[PDB]
A paper describes a structure:
In CbFDH, residue 120 (Val120) is a potential mutation site for studies aiming to create a more active enzyme variant as it is located in the catalytic and substrate-binding site. The lower K m value for formate for the Val120Thr mutant indicates an approximately 1.5-fold stronger affinity for substrate binding, while the higher k cat indicates a higher turnover number (6.57-fold) compared with the wild type. The overall catalytic efficiency (k cat/K m) is found to be approximately ten times greater in the mutant CbFDH. In order to observe the effect of the Val120Thr mutation, we determined the structure of the mutant CbFDH at 1.9 Å resolution and compared it with our wild-type structure. The structure is composed of two homodimers with 99.7% completeness. Superposition of wild-type CbFDH and the Val120Thr mutant demonstrated that the overall structure does not change significantly as a consequence of this single mutation (r.m.s.d. of 0.270 Å). However, a closer look at the mutation site revealed new hydrogen bonds that does not exist in wild-type CbFDH between the threonine at position 120 and three water molecules. In the mutation site, nonetheless, we observed three new hydrogen bonds between Thr120 and water molecules in the active site. These new hydrogen bonds may help to stabilize the active site, leading to greater activity. Also, the newly formed hydrogen bonds may help to position the substrate or coenzyme molecules in the active site and contribute to a more efficient electron-transfer process during the reaction. The reason for the increase in substrate affinity may be that threonine is more polar than valine, so that it can form hydrogen bonds to neighboring amino acids or water molecules, resulting in higher stability in the substrate-binding region.
Candida boidinii NAD+-dependent formate dehydrogenase (CbFDH) is a homodimeric 82 kDa enzyme complex that catalyzes the reversible conversion of formate and carbon dioxide using NAD+/NADH coenzymes for electron transfer. Candida boidinii NAD+-dependent formate dehydrogenase (CbFDH) has gained significant attention for its potential application in the production of biofuels and various industrial chemicals from inorganic carbon dioxide. Here, we present high-resolution crystal structures of apo CbFDH determined at cryogenic and ambient temperatures, as well as as that of the highly active Val120Thr mutant of CbFDH at cryogenic temperature. The inherent capability of the enzyme to catalyze the conversion of CO2 to formate holds significant potential for reducing atmospheric CO2 levels.
Numbering used by the authors:
A (entry chain B): 1 to 353
B (entry chain A): 1 to 356
Write the structure that this text describes.
C-alpha cells in the first residue's frame, strides 16, 4: 500500500534531536517499519498548490497521515481524487483540517482516527505554566536579567501568588480537568468550571470543583480564566469585547484550545485598557500567526502581561513519542485486518461516526 | 519609641501599586498606626556607609525592621552602637543579614523575629513555574512571538513534559516539601529528596518521596534538581564543577534558595557544555547581581535554557501583605508588653535561642 505522510520540514533541527519524530526528516520513526512490511512511504511537507507533491500522490494513496502542526487539508476535491483512500490518520490530536462531514456524506469506507489522549497532559502543563508565568509576572522579570537591569519593585508591583486565586475553566474535558487536577495543591480560593455536561461526582469532588451554569457568572468571579473547550458555534467568537467586559478587572486569561474562540482585537484592547492583567496561550487565528498579529505586540499598561508562544504545547518530544507510537498502533490495526482500534481514537469508522 | 525601618525605594512603582507595602514609600502600611501610638518612625533605603541614615539613628533606635530584599546588615559593629536596641524584625523570612551569633554569644538582651511561613508558598510556586518554563522551553518560544517569528521545530526540539521526569530536591524543609506537594499531580516518574534528616514517614508517603542518602547519587538519577536548603558549611559551593559532572546529562536545575550554594562560573560552564539543559531561579551571589554576572548572559547550545529572574519570588503582593501584617503583630506584641509572639517567629528571645 502507498502511505503519504505530511509533516513540516524541521531542517537542521531534525539533525539536532532524533526524538523530533514529527517531521519529514525523521518520518515518525516508522519508515523502516513500513518498508519492513512492504509498504511505500511518501513523505512531504509540500501540501499547497495543484502540483503539490501531496496532490500528485493522492490518486493512488491507500493511507494519508497528517498532523495539526503542518495540516494537510483533506478537502472536498482531494477526497474526490483519492480513489484508493482507505484511512486518514492524525499523528496527534485535532481534525479541523479534515472535511469529516463530506467523507461521511460520500458513503466511502474511509476510516479517520487520531491518537486521542497523546496531547492532553502536554497542553495541561502548558496552561498551568502560563497561569504561573502571568500571575507571578515572570516574563518582565526574566527580561530585566537578560537586559542587565535589576529593579525588583518594577516586577513586584504586579506579581502575585496563584494561591488564594479563583480559577475557572471553560470546558472540563480531558485537558481542562487535567488542569484542575494540577491546580489543587496550589491551594486556589476555589476551582470553577463551565461545560455542556457535568463532571462525574467523584471526579468533581477530587479537585473540589464547583460548576457554574452560565459563563457570565463564571468569568465575573474568576481571577484566572482558561479556555479548554472545543471550537464550535457556541464558542466561536466567544471571548469578544462584550464578554470581556464581565471579566473581573485585571483578570488573567489563558487559551490553549483554539484562537478563533477569541476575537483578537477585543482581547488585545482588553489587555491595553486593564480589563485583563495578562493573556497567554499558544493558539492563534489566523495560524500560523502573521507578523502583524496583534497578540504579538499587545501589552498591559506596565509593558507586560503577554505570555504568548507559537503553537507548540502539544508537540513536545514526549508528546511526539506518543504520537508516533499511536500512529503505528493505528496503522497496525489496519494492516492486519483486525481493525482493533482503541475506541477513543475513532473519528469515523469506515465513513460512519 | 524610635523604630528604624529599612526598605528599598520603589519610586514610581509605589504610586502605581499601593499594595506594594514593602518599600520606603508605603512603609509596610503601618506608618499611621505607629504615629497614633506615639512612636517615631525613621524610614530609609540608605544603609551603606557610616554616614547612612541607618547609622545616624542606630545609637538610639529601640526597634529595627529589616527585609531580605534590601538587607540592612545588623553587624557586630552596629549592635555595639545600638545602645537602646531591644528588637530586630525581619519583615519577611531570612536572617543572614543579622549577626545572631554575636547577639547570642554575648548575651545581649535583643529579640530577633521573622514572619515565619509567609514566603514559603511564594517561593514554592516560583520553583514549579521555573521547572515548567525550563522543561517546556517557554523562554525561546515567547521570544519568537515578540520578535515576529514562527518556527515550531526550533522550540519543540528541546521541549519536554514534566510528566515522567525524576525530580530531586536538595533540602526538604518548608519550601522543599511544598514544591514536592505541588508536583504530585504532574505525575513525575518519582519525587526524590536529600536532607541531613529524614522526613516523617507520613510526610514522605503523602508525596511519594524517596530519600537518597548522598547528593552524588541523588543528582545522578534526577532529570530535574531543585535547591531548597539553607546556606551553611555543608551547602556553600555545593553545586560546583565536580558535583555537576555527576548530574544526569541534560538535567534541569532550579535554585531559589541562595546563590552562594552554587559556584556561578561552574553552573554556566555546565549549561554551555550541555551537562545542564537549563538553569533557573531568582537567587544570586553577589546580590544584587552586577551587570556582568555570568548567569545573566549564559545560555545552552540552543540559545535558551536561562530562566533567571531578579530576587523577587518571595516579595509578591500576596506575600508582602503577610509580611506587613506579620510585622504589625510582632510590634503589637512588643508595644503591649505581652510578648505573645508566635512561637515559630522567634529567632532569638532576649538574645537566647528558644525551643522550636
Amino acid at each position: 500500500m502507498k502511505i503519504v505522510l505530511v509533516l513540516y520540514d524541521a531542517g537542521k533541527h531534525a539533525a539536532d534531536e532524533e526524538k523530533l519524530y514529527g517531521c519529514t526528516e525523521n518520518k515518525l520513526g516508522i519508515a523502516n517499519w513500513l518498508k519492513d512490511q512492504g509498504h511505500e512511504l511518501i513523505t512531504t511537507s509540500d501540501k499547497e498548490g495543484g502540483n503539490s507533491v501531496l496532490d500528485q500522490h493522492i490518486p493512488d494513496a491507500d493511507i494519508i497521515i497528517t498532523t495539526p502542526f503542518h495540516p494537510a487539508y483533506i478537502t472536498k476535491e482531494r477526497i474526490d481524487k483519492a480513489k484508493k483512500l482507505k484511512l486518514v490518520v492524525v499523528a496527534g490530536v485535532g481534525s479541523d483540517h479534515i472535511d469529516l462531514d463530506y467523507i461521511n456524506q460520500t458513503g466511502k469506507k474511509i476510516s479517520v482516527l487520531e491518537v486521542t489522549g497523546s496531547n492532553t497532559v502536554s497542553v495541561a502543563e502548558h496552561v498551568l505554566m502560563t497561569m504561573l508565568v502571568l500571575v507571578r509576572n515572570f516574563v518582565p522579570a526574566h527580561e530585566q536579567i537578560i537586559n542587565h537591569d535589576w529593579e525588583v519593585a518594577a516586577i513586584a508591583k504586579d506579581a502575585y501568588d496563584i494561591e488564594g486565586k479563583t480559577i475557572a475553566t471553560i470546558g472540563a474535558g480531558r485537558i481542562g480537568y487535567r488542569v484542575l487536577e494540577r491546580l489543587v495543591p496550589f491551594n486556589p480560593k476555589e476551582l470553577l468550571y463551565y461545560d455542556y455536561q457535568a463532571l462525574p461526582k467523584d471526579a468533581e469532588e477530587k479537585v473540589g470543583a464547583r460548576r457554574v451554569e452560565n459563563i457570565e457568572e463564571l468569568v465575573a468571579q474568576a481571577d484566572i480564566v482558561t479556555i479548554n473547550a472545543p471550537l464550535h458555534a457556541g464558542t466561536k467568537g466567544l471571548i469578544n469585547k462584550e464578554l470581556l467586559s464581565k471579566f473581573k478587572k485585571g483578570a488573567w486569561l489563558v487559551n490553549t484550545a483554539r484562537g478563533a474562540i477569541c476575537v483578537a482585537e477585543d482581547v488585545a484592547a482588553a489587555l491595553e485598557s486593564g480589563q485583563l492583567r495578562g493573556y497567554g496561550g499558544d493558539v492563534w487565528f489566523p495560524q500560523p500567526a502573521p507578523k502583524d498579529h496583534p497578540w504579538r505586540d499587545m501589552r498591559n499598561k506596565y509593558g507586560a502581561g503577554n505570555a504568548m508562544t507559537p503553537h507548540y504545547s502539544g508537540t513536545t518530544l514526549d508528546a511526539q513519542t506518543r504520537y508516533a507510537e499511536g500512529t503505528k498502533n493505528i496503522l497496525e490495526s489496519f494492516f492486519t485486518g483486525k481493525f482493533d482500534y482503541r475506541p477513543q481514537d475513532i473519528i469515523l469508522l469506515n465513513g460512519e461516526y
